[PDB]
Symmetry: C5
Subunit: 197 residues, 5 copies
């Protein structure tokens, strides 16, 4: 089996519109901040660029790689992808990078889109020594905690040295929203502690 | 399993056909949850808002026996009929910020809650006073009259503190959602709408 | 026949890319702009940004069905229909369609399409801040069908439709037919000239 | 009838294949009619213009016997091969303002006239003087060299409401070898001589 | 065989979503930027808007055809071909492709793709109004193919607009190979250093 056969077999068994679950699909999400482009302390809005490292398992994709490549890049339109959204986004995610994921032969998927997006978050203290804490909430838009679970995994490693801002700290913790409109939806709450240089 | 449910939904779903049951109007429920007010122009009477547009209706063609299978799935809206709702006083296209998936329940109930950013022409006078501005947003079927689609509010009366970001430079005083009817001189029939009154002011 | 059968039959006989001429008469298209809002006016650059309902009607007899025991009207996505290739000659932006792209088809073949459009125009903005106002002329016609294939006809002060929250008020809208020969082509192209007389409140 | 002509065009039309006949280049004619000059920045040397790009070529794969049938139809350009023309000094994507339909004549001649709004990098110096600015716009095939596509050139529709007036438009042909490739690429250079109507 | 037959056969054998590696060798992708314009420079935000032709070449032997009796090159829409998933790591906008998305395929399988791209970057704009100028570094490589699947290898002002407010002093292109914390394998990039200043 070569890469074409692996992609062909992924298309036979992949159901892009069907969650590949008695138990939730465990989605891992971790943000690497690349840039903070604009901050508005009057409107409490920030424009950021981040790599959204997203992993999950889909065992329907698995193949025997004893005599064949054990990983391929696949367009995400061929795969089920978690319907993750930033709950406090005030613009559409601008995906800056090719929309390809890596599929490993055991069914593990890795997707790392570079996203530019505007958020509503607390920008107070951005001009002080201890900085602002901007919380970004990412979770399934339409799958509750029994269908999708979300778990978090240096902070400045890929952060642009040319930003007007610097990162003091990033903490990623698991949370839960119930709204009366819609059971409980799990999210990762990413606390970006940043200040002006 | 979920694949069978999605497959069967695609066999019977007709995305371009209103799913009327015995020639009754399709009863669409619409309720806006304001999340943010981004820009307000008192000179041009224009507001830019983000809201969750909670939308429900029934399509019994979708129904399935869930006695031994999941009773709900997430389905891309391109696989479903969706009501052709428009904001009659919008001055921009609805920007949908979220994945375009609806929940289908096994009895045929559909729930769709897109997060939308949209600009409106509405009354911004009083925004910098204690009693605030009242911006009315009119949402209804663009092309289905009252005998094909009926539109009802969920919650009539609310202050939306459940949903509205306290990081906005605006605060919400009151949201009232009431049913209305427009007849235009284009057409003899009436189009039903929900009129959402957003009472808000600058902090 | 139910609504699904009507849509199915419309897709069998509808030819979206073929002008539905009957016995090589032109397709009679009716066009009427109902101004909803005037959003930006620049007296220096002579540019206006407006929102209008472009009320468009025509007949396509290929669509007709027997409605004696069935609904006599349906909403159809415009991608399933032939639609006239109308363009605003003096537009300086693409038409931004704000509304769902569905038309109503009546069982005799009459089609009604009313998109809400936001669009920028190059037109005469002089006098906008005076009592008699500006007169901004918008020219709409078929882009590629001459007068033997498409005829365009108008169907007012527009107080029914125009937002009282605009900074502008409408004094008058007049819609008049024209027929122009262009240097590319020997045939005449029909247009409606819409004269929007408006001023600052 | 028109439906049969469109049906036959869809049988033989290859939108992704240049319709060269034997070894011969497809002869593309391009001529710009300027409609508006909207924004001019003399500091950045950038202009925003609206023009009707009159484009003609032959595709004999489309040709049909019109002795008993209409000799012309409007066809969506997605059903046709269209030359891959690009403005080399454009700094924005062409905004096509008009329905994307071409006229096909029964002998295979195609006429396509999109109304385009586009921003260019060009010489705006002199715009506020009597002699005006000369903005050169360079258009040619992006991926077909001179043996596959040849390009030849050929105020009437200019808006009276522009802040600018047109003094002169000249179109000349050029043929350039670029360091990517051993073959020559043809372009038309359109020289728009224009000036501000006001004082400064 | 005519051009229609060549396109038809390319569609039979082309797998647009499958990297055309031969026997576990990386696909050798060649990338070289020709700068056309520097449009907007913000010295406060360290952001620049540039236009460049991204000259991109690789081999895909699945596309090869016998050209003894037929043209040996055609223009093909890139949606019919595998194209390397190149990304500019320090871009802060999507690439705006200004040109028709057609590549040239030679009968031996060589592909040439030269999109004209307008894109905004986060890079060092300090010194732009001085004699030695700013150095804006643009980092391009495969987003999802590591060094064993894709390798990337590299006259500056030749196509640069004389009407820009900026002039180019120097362009250097160097190869790099980076391991990122997601993944055990190395990703290749070209780092393009654009040294420019205000006229
Ligand atoms: C090199 C980048 C990357 C690697 C792998 C993938 C994939 F597996 F998801 F396809 N996407 C992007 S990077 C720099 O964004 N890795 C990190 N962190
Ligand atoms: C009337 C316009 C027109 C005519 C013909 C065509 C076509 F043949 F390309 F379809 N398009 C536009 S106009 C005025 O733009 N033609 C000229 N000049
Ligand atoms: C002439 C241009 C060109 C040539 C060839 C190709 C192709 F083969 F990739 F399709 N694209 C564009 S140019 C001027 O942009 N090449 C260079 N430099
Ligand atoms: C409000 C959001 C949501 C939940 C459920 C649905 C459903 F209709 F698809 F079921 N759509 C949207 S959510 C996940 O609670 N967001 C937040 N914050
Ligand atoms: C004008 C609006 C409407 C009515 C009918 C049609 C159709 F026939 F083309 F389908 N489209 C739009 S409406 C609903 O009256 N506007 C509001 N306000």
């Amino acid at each position: 089996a070569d890469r074409a056969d692996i992609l062909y077999n992924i298309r036979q068994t992949s159901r892009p519109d069907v969650i590949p679950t008695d138990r939730p699909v465990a989605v891992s999400v971790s943000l690497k901040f690349i840039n903070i482009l604009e901050v508005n302390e009057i409107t409490n809005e920030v424009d950021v660029v981040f790599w959204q490292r997203t992993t999950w398992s889909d065992r329907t994709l698995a193949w025997d790689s004893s005599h064949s490549p054990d990983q391929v890049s696949v367009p995400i339109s061929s795969l089920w992808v978690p319907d993750l959204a930033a709950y406090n986004a005030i613009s559409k995610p601008e995906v800056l990078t090719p929309q390809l994921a890596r599929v490993v032969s055991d069914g593990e998927v890795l997707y790392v889109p570079s996203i530019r997006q505007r958020f509503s978050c607390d920008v107070s203290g951005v001009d002080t020594e201890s900085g602002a804490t901007c919380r970004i909430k990412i979770g399934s838009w339409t799958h509750h905690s029994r269908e999708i679970s979300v778990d978090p995994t240096d902070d400045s490693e890929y952060f642009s040295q040319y930003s007007r801002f610097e990162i003091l700290d990033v903490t990623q913790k698991k949370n839960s929203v119930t709204y009366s409109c819609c059971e409980a939806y799990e999210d990762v709450e990413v606390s970006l502690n940043f200040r002006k240089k």
